[PDB]
């Protein structure tokens, strides 16, 4: 149960 307004599968965390 992930609650993230701007969730994206492919995001590179910096």
């Amino acid at each position, epitope marked *: *149960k992930v609650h993230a*307004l*701007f969730y*994206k599968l*492919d995001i*590179v965390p*910096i």
Partner: antibody
Amino acid sequence: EVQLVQSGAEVKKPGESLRISCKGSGYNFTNYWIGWVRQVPGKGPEWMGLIYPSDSDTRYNPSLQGHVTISADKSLTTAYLRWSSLRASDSATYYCVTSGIYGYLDYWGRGTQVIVSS
Amino acid sequence: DIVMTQSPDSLAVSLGERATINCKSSQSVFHSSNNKNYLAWYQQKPGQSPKLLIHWASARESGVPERISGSGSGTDFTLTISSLQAEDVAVYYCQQYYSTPLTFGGGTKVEIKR
């Protein structure tokens, strides 16, 4: 090191168009949110929107009801904020920001001052 | 629709003393499933751009000194600066990222009391 280079200050008149820009460096630009926060002296910052350049997914603040558009060029690793018809209320400093999936803004630009006056 | 409120608007603190800034959200920003408050704190120094200080209400960014701490839960949060230094003079802003649109508090300007 993450860098967010914004374009210089702008003086314009009501009813004119404007596009300010912010080039990001030091990170995978296409796969991280980049957006804009507005600041006028009399209240706190106002969030304007974010864009995920990889797929052009754009998230706007409903309060800004179609007054501005956000876009991004992946080849230039640059984000844009555009007004088609500036109003006096648009006088503010505009910071470009980055965000992960949660919505806290972990990197901020130096800011772009925008003056709208007849 | 979440309104973020801060108090006081300006806070004067003597050097080496504690500064306590309060932030209120009109709705809870706490998720039971992950036990996290969706609350961030930013620092804007004179003539500079805001700087992320804290997220998850109490997790400091890298480089932020331990004397700067965030606490609270639900709708009431505080930022604390335990031994104020001249470099801590700034405007501090809270921000909720629990619901869109993201909204900020009005800010609290921390200054030197003499």
